[PDB]
Structures are given as structure tokens and as C-alpha cells.
């Protein structure tokens, strides 16, 4: 995935989830839209 | 084969044949066990199981008791089999429909018959790598496959055809007739022609007549073969396949026969090369050595062609596939050794004025007092259009001022041809360009032609720049067939290439695509096609009319020589 120090919604189907405090972007449209840490 | 590999299915594969190829197949041997547990096969005739033996490499086997792991489908397919071979005559059917099963022997002879007409195909299963199943198929080759005289005779053409030009009963008594299925290359005699005598006997030294090539050939050393290994034989009987050293003219598929034998046999049809590449010996001058080799190997494969197009200096090698063309290149490095790197074909560009017109002119002071004569012309450029005439060198004679000497008034367009003939723009010829001499100057004493053509040459030069011509590359009419699932991707690839398209057409067993693509383009198109179509497509190029293209290369190949 991507460990950008600033995760953003790259698409419309991206969601921001905060599992384990870590703020992640998970997109069930494009797997290149998977980011790790806010 | 490969019934010892997971995914193995005798039944499914049979259906596959029926569903896809089109054949209706009759099972001969079902299978005992799964892929790992492939014990052997079940005959639908002997009603036995030839469980083979692992310790020996299939050399020994045991006919067995047809175990219940598989004793029930056997009955179904045995029953389905009788019905089909029994489908050869009512004499079998009247008893078959009599509720009685016809004898296996009547089934096996009936089987051999149905195969002859291609009504049915017999399916045998085994694993060669597992050393199992192979011995039975070799047995069923005996049982249903045709012996030379188990079908009708070879037919022929005689003297431009006849009622029955050839009805050559394959016999040790009929006159010698043969076909050279293959020409192969042996470096020590220089050839090896594989022939099957359809009807006849031939012997060492016998002369033969090339019905197709109308010539005399002597068979010097008839040999039989075990692949590479060869064993000389004095004579070949009909129905025997042999290799003939000492034959130097027979093309693949050319009949070799005694005199007064059929001129033409059916094998006159062959595929068309689909890939083209070019080649160069490392040493620039090994080109003939390389060239001869390409030629010899071209005789052996009617599908490998070598034409060195004289538009450019390049040696062009055409072939049915990328492997072939590479397998055809390592053979040169290995036999007839030459070292050669392959490349790209050159570019057959042309040019033409767009529309612009003027009254351009040229002139040299050829007089200077002493020299004695001069020539000068005022010309008038126009194009016609890209593809209106067969005679690309169009022209109109007008001149009525400075009317150049009469005996070569009409002889002053052909000397100008040598500019339209080749290269004004980037070393590429001109099409459809129209020239028009209207004015000029001369004097009718002896208006020197060879130094008057300088006026014509600078007339072309100046005329060309003012007229702003264009450059039109070669673009052809491609036609493709493919399964109706790869249309999106094949057209996407054509689209990546600079290709226009022609026909919203779909076949019944596929889809016929028509596309206009460049000729410098599509290098190695065939392999890309196979890749994206699962090796299930063909195509053709029709050399259609040339079309213009914005190209950074047209000028860099003449700016290669700069000014």
C-alpha cells in the first residue's frame, strides 16, 4: 500500500477507516487507492 | 494422452472434440481410474482392462476383469459404440434392431469402414510418459486406419485433364507415380526428397519424369529412415515412404513419376508467410554466403521466402512465425554457418503536391559566347489526387513561348521523368504529380539536351519547394478473422497502431475485421495477434493506396545526410 504521511480519498469509493488509531484509506474500487497513515 | 495429469478427463475431452472441432467421436477405450491412479484402459470390444505393469516400461500388461470402479459406464459407451459402428449398414442394424448385438468383428470391420468415410473418429487414451496406453493405440492403428488399398486410388490430370486421367490403383504393377512431400537439406549431397510412391515400383538409378516440372530426374540413392538415421534400399514399392538423394528439381508437392503419368496431384496449396524481418551478416560482404543459405532453406520450406526488395538494399526474410524465422536463422548460424543479426524492414515512402500551382522556371547562361547554345523552361506544377490515375507520371504539354526544339518537344517529359522517378523528397519517389511546361527559351541550331536538362532539374527543384508537396506512407487493407471474444482487444491494438477500420462485420464462426494500417507499421503484428487472441487468428495485407502521415522520421532520414 501507500504510507504517505497524508492519506486522502483518491476516488469516490475510498473510505477513511481508523483501525488501531492508524488512519487508513481503503477503496473497494481501485486497489491502488489503499493508503496507510493519516 | 496425459490421462496421468490432474484435470484429466476422457469423457470431457471427447465432448470437447464434438463441441469444438466438430467431429463426432466414438469411444474405444474408457479409462480405469483417475489421473494419478490411471491403471489402464477398458476396451469397448474385448470388454477387458489392459492394466499395464509399472516395473517394466509398459512392455508387459495384463488383460483383466473389468472391475466395478468402472463396469457401468463401460456398458453405456460399449452400447453407444455398437450402435455407431452398427451404423454402417442395415444388415448390421436389422440384427441390431433385432435386439441382437452384432459381432465385434463386424463391428471392427464396420469401424474401419466408418473411419474411411470420416463418419466417426475412434478415441484411445493413454499416458506415454507413464508408459501406459501406447501399445493399445498402436493396435488400433492396425484396426481402423486405412491401408494404401483400403480406400480409392490417387487421381490425376492428364494432358490438360481427362475423364479419368489417373485412377492409379496403388499397386506393385501400376506405372511409377509419387509425390515429394518434403525436400530437406543434407549438407553432403545437398538434398533429401521424401517421397511416398502412390502407385508403382522404382529402383536405384531409375529415371523419373517431373510431371509438374516437365523434366527428367534420376533417383540415385533411395533410402528409408529412422528420423535422422537413414538405411539405403534398392527399391521402393507402392505405399512406402522413402527419402531420395540425387533429386535436384522437385519442389515440395511436385509429383515424381514414370513418363506418361499424372501431371498434377492435389497438393498444390500452401499457406502465406505472415511475419517479415530483415538480416545482415556481421561481415558486410558475407551477404551472398548468407544469401545462398536463405535460398536453400527457402527450397525446403515453401513457407520461408527470401526477397531482397530492390527499393532498398535490405535482405528480407518472410516466414510463418517468430519462432520459425528464428529457427530459420540459427540454422544459418549452425549449418551454412554465417553470423547474422535481424532487424527492421525499410520504408517505402512517396510524395505528391498538395494543391499549390505556380509558373516556376529555371535557367542557366549556357552561352558565355564560346559554348554556343542554351536551354530554359518555365514549368507549372499540379498534383492530380492520391489515386486517380494508373499513370502516376501525369503531364500536359502546352509550350507556345520559347518552344523548345521540335524533334524533342515530346522528348522533354521523359528526361524529366528521372525526377518523378525517384527521391525529390527525402529520397522517395513521386506519384500523381503533374508537370506543365508552358514557357521557356532555346535556339534551334543544336540546343544541347544534356546541358538543357539542367534547366529542367532546377525547374523541378524550385518547383518542388514552392508547390509544398506532402509525404504519403504505405498503408494497406488488412483483413482479420478472430473469435468473437477478442474483438475489443484486437481493435484496441489496431487503434494503438495508426489504423483506420473498414467493416462492421461479424462472421458465424468468428468476426471478420477490416482495417487500414501502415506498412512500416505492423512489424511483428502476427505474434501480437496470436498473443492477444490465444493463437487463433489469421490476417492478410492487401497493399492498398498510400496515405500521408505526420512523421518525425521522414526528415531525420534525409537530415541524416543533413542539407
Amino acid at each position: 500500500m501507500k504510507v504517505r504521511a497524508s492519506v486522502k480519498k483518491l476516488c469516490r469509493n475510498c473510505k477513511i477507516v481508523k483501525r488501531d488509531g492508524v488512519i487508513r484509506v481503503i477503496c473497494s474500487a481501485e486497489p491502488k487507492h489503499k493508503q496507510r497513515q493519516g | 494422452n496425459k490421462m496421468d495429469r490432474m484435470g484429466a478427463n476422457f469423457l470431457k475431452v471427447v465432448n470437447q472434440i464434438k463441441t469444438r472441432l466438430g467431429a463426432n467421436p466414438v469411444p474405444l477405450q474408457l479409462a480405469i481410474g483417475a489421473e494419478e491412479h490411471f491403471t489402464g484402459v477398458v476396451d469397448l470390444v474385448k470388454m477387458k482392462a489392459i492394466n499395464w505393469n509399472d516395473a517394466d516400461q509398459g512392455v508387459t500388461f495384463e488383460y483383466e476383469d473389468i472391475p466395478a470402479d468402472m463396469v457401468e459406464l463401460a456398458n453405456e459407451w460399449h452400447q453407444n459404440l455398437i450402435e455407431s459402428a452398427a451404423e454402417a449398414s442395415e444388415e448390421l442394424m436389422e440384427k441390431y434392431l433385432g435386439g441382437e448385438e452384432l459381432t465385434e468383428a463386424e463391428i471392427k470391420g464396420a469401424l474401419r469402414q466408418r473411419v474411411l468415410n470420416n463418419e466417426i473418429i475412434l478415441v484411445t487414451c493413454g499416458s506415454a510418459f507413464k508408459n501406459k496406453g501406447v501399445q493399445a493405440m498402436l493396435d488400433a492403428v492396425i484396426d481402423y486406419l486405412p491401408s494404401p488399398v483400403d480406400v480409392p486410388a490417387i487421381n490425376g490430370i492428364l494432358d490438360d485433364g481427362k475423364d479419368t486421367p489417373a485412377e492409379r490403383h496403388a499397386s506393385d504393377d501400376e506405372p511409377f507415380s509419387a509425390l515429394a512431400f518434403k525436400i530437406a537439406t543434407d549438407p553432403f549431397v545437398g538434398n533429401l526428397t521424401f517421397f511416398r510412391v502412390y502407385s508403382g515400383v522404382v529402383n536405384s538409378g531409375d529415371t523419373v519424369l517431373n510431371s509438374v516440372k516437365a523434366a527428367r530426374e534420376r533417383f540415385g540413392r533411395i533410402v528409408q529412415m529412422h528420423a535422422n538415421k537413414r538405411e539405403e534400399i534398392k527399391e521402393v514399392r507402392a505405399g512406402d515412404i522413402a527419402a531420395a538423394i540425387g533429386l535436384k528439381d522437385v519442389t515440395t508437392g511436385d509429383t515424381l513419376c514414370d513418363p506418361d503419368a499424372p501431371i498434377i496431384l492435389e497438393r498444390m496449396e500452401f499457406p502465406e508467410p505472415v511475419i517479415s524481418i530483415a538480416v545482415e551478416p556481421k561481415t558486410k560482404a558475407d551477404q551472398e554466403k548468407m544469401g545462398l543459405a536463405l535460398g536453400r532453406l527457402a527450397k525446403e520450406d515453401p513457407s520461408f521466402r527470401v526477397w531482397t526488395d530492390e527499393e532498398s538494399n535490405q535482405t528480407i526474410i518472410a516466414g510463418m512465425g517468430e519462432l520459425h524465422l528464428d529457427i530459420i536463422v540459427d540454422r544459418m548460424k549452425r549449418e551454412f554457418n554465417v553470423e547474422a543479426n535481424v532487424g527492421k524492414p525499410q520504408v517505402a515512402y512517396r510524395e505528391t503536391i498538395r494543391q499549390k500551382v505556380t509558373d516556376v522556371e529555371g535557367k542557366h547562361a549556357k552561352q558565355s559566347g564560346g559554348r554556343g547554345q542554351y536551354g530554359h523552361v518555365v514549368i507549372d506544377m499540379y498534383p492530380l489526387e492520391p489515386g486517380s490515375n494508373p499513370k502516376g507520371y501525369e503531364f500536359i504539354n502546352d509550350i507556345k513561348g520559347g518552344v523548345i526544339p521540335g524533334e524533342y518537344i515530346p522528348a522533354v517529359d521523359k528526361g524529366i521523368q528521372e525526377q518523378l522517378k525517384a527521391g525529390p523528397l527525402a529520397g522517395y519517389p513521386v506519384v500523381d504529380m503533374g508537370i506543365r511546361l508552358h514557357f521557356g527559351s532555346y535556339h534551334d541550331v543544336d540546343s544541347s539536351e544534356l546541358a538543357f536538362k539542367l534547366a529542367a532539374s532546377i525547374a523541378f527543384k524550385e518547383g518542388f519547394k514552392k508547390a509544398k508537396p506532402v509525404l504519403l506512407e504505405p498503408i494497406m487493407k488488412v483483413e482479420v478473422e478472430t473469435p468473437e471474444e477478442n474483438t475489443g482487444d484486437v481493435i484496441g491494438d489496431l487503434s494503438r497502431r495508426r489504423g483506420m477500420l473498414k467493416g462492421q462485420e461479424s462472421e458465424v464462426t468468428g468476426v471478420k475485421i477490416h482495417a487500414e494500417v501502415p506498412l512500416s507499421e505492423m512489424f511483428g503484428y502476427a505474434t501480437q495477434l496470436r498473443s492477444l487472441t490465444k493463437g487463433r487468428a489469421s490476417y492478410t495485407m492487401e497493399f492498398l493506396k498510400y496515405d500521408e502521415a505526420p512523421s518525425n522520421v521522414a526528415q531525420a532520414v534525409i537530415e541524416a545526410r543533413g542539407k
Partner: protein, 141 residues
């Protein structure tokens, strides 16, 4: 027996029937041949658009034949040959985008109200009026 399930717009509008060659092999999905290529369009392609735009539908049904209640004289040809100026969109904001007037509107209203109709004969008339007016420039009449 289905509504056209082959919408592939690669057909020159009118002109030659089934004009695939100029149109490109990029609409290849449909299975039409020399059997369905001269059945009905060849015999009823005169009084709609003879050298003008009349977009052809992609109807290929499973009655084992090709036939349907075809549309009316297309407004695309009506407002481009009843105009004189054969222009339209693309150069509508610079110069003449074609001609469209109340006379052309009456023509299309009394002509293309047979089968290419909507929520009225006059409503498909307003359809043709829109296909004539939204060209980008209209004659004032």
C-alpha cells in the same frame, strides 16, 4: 423478437444502405450480411433522405427476419436539406450553423409525424424544431 440489442453507431446516416466501409470495423458486433443488407432499407430508403443524414437503427430481431415499423422522414435530413445551409454544431458560434425557420418547422411537422412521434404529432414537430434550431444558428422567419 426484441428491441434492437445491437446499438452500434458506425453507420453513415442514410446514403448507401448499410454503409459499413466508411464507418469503420469498430462496430463489428452485429451479424448482418448480404441477406439482410438489401431486404428492407434498399427498398424503402428513397423518400426519407436521398443523400442526407437519416440515422439508421440497429434492429436485428429473432423472428428469423428483419422488419419493423420504421421511423418517419428523419428530422436530421429534414432540417439539413430543407435548409440550404448544411451546417450545424461545431461551427455554430462563428458563422451560419444551417437554416431553420417556421416554414421548415411546418414542413417537418406535416412530414415526420408518422412514426417518429412523441407526446404529440405537434410534439415530435417541436422535436424536429429543436433538431433544426439547436444547430447554433437559425434563419429568421
Amino acid at each position: 423478437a426484441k428491441k434492437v440489442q445491437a446499438y452500434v453507431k458506425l453507420q453513415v446516416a442514410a446514403g448507401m444502405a448499410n454503409p459499413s466501409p466508411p464507418v469503420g470495423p469498430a462496430l463489428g458486433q452485429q451479424g448482418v450480411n448480404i441477406m439482410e443488407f438489401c431486404k428492407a432499407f434498399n427498398a424503402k430508403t428513397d423518400s426519407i433522405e436521398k443523400g442526407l443524414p437519416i440515422p439508421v437503427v440497429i434492429t436485428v430481431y429473432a423472428d428469423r427476419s428483419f422488419t419493423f415499423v420504421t421511423k418517419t422522414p428523419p428530422a436530421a435530413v429534414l432540417l439539413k436539406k430543407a435548409a440550404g445551409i448544411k451546417s450545424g454544431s461545431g461551427k455554430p458560434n462563428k458563422d451560419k450553423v444551417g437554416k431553420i425557420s417556421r416554414a421548415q418547422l411546418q414542413e417537418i411537422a406535416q412530414t415526420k409525424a408518422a412514426d417518429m412521434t412523441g407526446a404529440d404529432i405537434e410534439a415530435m414537430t417541436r422535436s424536429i424544431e429543436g433538431t433544426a434550431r439547436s444547430m447554433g444558428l437559425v434563419v429568421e422567419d
